[PDB]
Amino acid sequence: GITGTWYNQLGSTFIVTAGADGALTGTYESGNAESRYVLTGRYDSAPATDGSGTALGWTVAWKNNYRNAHSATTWSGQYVGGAEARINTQWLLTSGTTEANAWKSTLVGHDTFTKVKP
Amino acid sequence: GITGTWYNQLGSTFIVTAGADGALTGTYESGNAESRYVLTGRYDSAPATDGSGTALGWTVAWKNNYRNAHSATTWSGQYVGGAEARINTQWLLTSGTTEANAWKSTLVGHDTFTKVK
Amino acid sequence: GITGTWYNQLGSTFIVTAGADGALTGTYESAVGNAESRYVLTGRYDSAPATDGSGTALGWTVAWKNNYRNAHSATTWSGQYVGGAEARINTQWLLTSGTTEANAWKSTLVGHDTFTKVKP
Amino acid sequence: AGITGTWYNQLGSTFIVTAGADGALTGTYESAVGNAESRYVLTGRYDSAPATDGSGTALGWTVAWKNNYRNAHSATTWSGQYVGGAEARINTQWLLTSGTTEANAWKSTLVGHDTFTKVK
Numbered sequence: 001g002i003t004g005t006w007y008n009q010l011g012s013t014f015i016v017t018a019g020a021d022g023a024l025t026g027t028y029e030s031g032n033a034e035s036r037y038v039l040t041g042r043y044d045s046a047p048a049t050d051g052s053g054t055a056l057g058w059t060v061a062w063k064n065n066y067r068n069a070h071s072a073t074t075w076s077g078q079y080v081g082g083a084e085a086r087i088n089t090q091w092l093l094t095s096g097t098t099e100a101n102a103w104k105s106t107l108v109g110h111d112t113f114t115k116v117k118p
Numbered sequence: 119g120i121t122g123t124w125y126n127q128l129g130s131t132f133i134v135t136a137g138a139d140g141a142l143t144g145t146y147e148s149g150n151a152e153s154r155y156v157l158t159g160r161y162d163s164a165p166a167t168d169g170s171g172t173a174l175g176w177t178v179a180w181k182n183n184y185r186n187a188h189s190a191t192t193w194s195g196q197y198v199g200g201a202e203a204r205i206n207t208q209w210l211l212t213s214g215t216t217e218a219n220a221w222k223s224t225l226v227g228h229d230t231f232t233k234v235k
Numbered sequence: 236g237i238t239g240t241w242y243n244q245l246g247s248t249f250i251v252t253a254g255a256d257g258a259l260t261g262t263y264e265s266a267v268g269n270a271e272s273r274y275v276l277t278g279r280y281d282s283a284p285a286t287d288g289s290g291t292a293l294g295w296t297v298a299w300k301n302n303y304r305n306a307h308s309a310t311t312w313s314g315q316y317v318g319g320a321e322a323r324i325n326t327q328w329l330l331t332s333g334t335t336e337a338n339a340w341k342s343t344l345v346g347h348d349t350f351t352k353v354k355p
Numbered sequence: 356a357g358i359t360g361t362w363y364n365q366l367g368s369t370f371i372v373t374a375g376a377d378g379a380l381t382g383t384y385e386s387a388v389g390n391a392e393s394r395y396v397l398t399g400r401y402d403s404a405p406a407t408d409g410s411g412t413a414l415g416w417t418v419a420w421k422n423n424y425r426n427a428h429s430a431t432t433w434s435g436q437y438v439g440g441a442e443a444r445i446n447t448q449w450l451l452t453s454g455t456t457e458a459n460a461w462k463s464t465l466v467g468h469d470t471f472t473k474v475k
């Protein structure tokens with residue numbers, strides 16, 4: 001299922017546990033200790049039984065004991081099981097800004113995760 | 119300044135606690151238990167003190183003990199303090215779909231939250 | 236109707252003509268970013284919208300190059316026109332810069348602009 | 356510029372575009388089979404003087420989903436960059452806005468990504 005270690009297309013490492021209560025918990029590394037960050041999120045713990053994927057999302061605030069970028073990324077997507085399981089996401093990365101700079105505060109993109117290094 | 123009850127522009131209520139460890143926890147509703155959902159997220163617990171906002175994000179999966187939309191929303195944004203404090207966000211709402219329908223799986227929008235409804 | 240001069244919430248000026256064939260043409264002047272004076276825009280709109288109270292779907296693009304500056308970037312606005320006593324165009328936008336492959340992951344900004352014929 | 360010609364996305368769609376000397380994109384967006392009912396006008400803009408440091412070329416375009424045969428009351432904008440070479444690509448993110456009532460406007464806009472190649 002969702003619980004496990006995943007890698008995006010750029011080599012980031014997503015170590016996640018999907019709990020019985022719909023919770024996602026774990027760590028995100030965008031490969032050393034000072035690049036590891038806490039993540040939390042939620043997933044559909046009772047997905048449809050018609051072949052559909054499992055909706056999920058999570059957040060990382062880019063502060064740890066070593067760095068603080070004053071920013072946070074959310075990933076929104078779905079887990080697709082099968083022979084090569086995949087989590088397909090789109091993401092929003094918002095930085096803290098002044099009001100005058102808020103129009104350019106948010107980047108957008110897409111990440112795909114597999115259980116194998118790219 | 120984040121902990122408390124917040125209201126978006128469409129009548130939803132966002133009840134959140136910002137913990138010392140950077141955690142966001144709480145509930146999201148659009149007023150009975152049937153419409154209330156768990157949320158979890160993260161925020162910058164050491165923001166700049168130069169007028170910049172506080173970056174944050176959270177997720178709701180749209181399942182509770184009564185309903186399940188097989189979907190989840192993530193909000194990404196910043197808290198802005200002051201006399202009219204706000205949480206300004208953009209959001210992504212992904213539904214569980216088949217592969218053939220995955221191209222249309224994700225809605226995008228924006229929500230602004232205030233401390234008074 | 237869509238044809239007219241519009242302003243967003245940040246002071247940008249959007250001067251547009253909606254042609255009978257579905258074409259949007261005109262100029263955009265931005266109050267933010269690496270921008271000066273007017274830039275060409277082109278786009279499309281639904282020339283036969285639904286009659287059930289729905290807005291009119293539309294979109295347009297500005298490449299941020301003119302005779303004065305070139306930011307090596309382009310914005311697309313996607314949205315709908317909503318008529319009424321306070322006519323409005325509500326949009327969400329994507330702004331992509333030309334980048335190297337190593338920097339492409341952070342090539343695209345996203346936001347939302349609302350346009351009115353009265354300048355806020 | 357390398358942009359003019361026929362491009363194919365990952366899901367069976369095709370577009371033929373001309374990149375004008377002035378920065379104009381004009382052409383037609385269609386399905387793989389190419390029947391008349393699947394063809395729509397496309398219009399956009401690109402950076403006609405891109406950087407020379409290995410960066411991509413920023414561009415965008417719009418298709419309103421109305422033709423002489425059908426009308427979905429919606430429009431898509433693609434925002435992205437062209438990357439040249441033997442394996443040329445246009446890498447995009449897109450926004451698809453439908454005309455809606457105010458009460459349904461919150462769910463009016465879909466978001467995704469498309470990659471285009473010169474080979475089907």
Ligand SMILES: COC(=O)c1cncc(-c2cc3c(=O)[nH]ccc3o2)c1
Pocket residue numbers: 008012030035062067069071073091093109111
């Ligand atoms: C030291 O700073 C960081 O590691 C850092 C800062 N700011 C953003 C990101 C990051 C990583 C990442 C990703 O894997 N997918 C989508 C977005 C995204 O953003 C990482």
Ligand SMILES: COC(=O)c1cncc(-c2cc3c(=O)[nH]ccc3o2)c1
Pocket residue numbers: 126130148153180185187189191209211227229
């Ligand atoms: C019964 O189903 C629901 O309550 C439900 C289902 N699917 C989505 C949403 C919802 C609410 C909401 C919001 O306040 N801001 C952004 C997105 C968003 O999505 C609610």
Ligand SMILES: COC(=O)c1cncc(-c2cc3c(=O)[nH]ccc3o2)c1
Pocket residue numbers: 243247265266267268269270299306307308310328330332346348
């Ligand atoms: C990275 O951004 C640029 O290079 C840039 C240059 N010049 C103008 C703009 C600009 C202006 C503008 C607006 O009014 N609404 C939405 C997006 C947007 O982007 C962006």
Ligand SMILES: COC(=O)c1cncc(-c2cc3c(=O)[nH]ccc3o2)c1
Pocket residue numbers: 364368392393420427429431449451467469
């Ligand atoms: C015949 O086609 C339609 O009626 C139609 C209606 N509504 C949307 C689309 C469409 C096609 C398409 C795409 O190739 N990439 C991204 C978005 C996208 O949207 C097509």
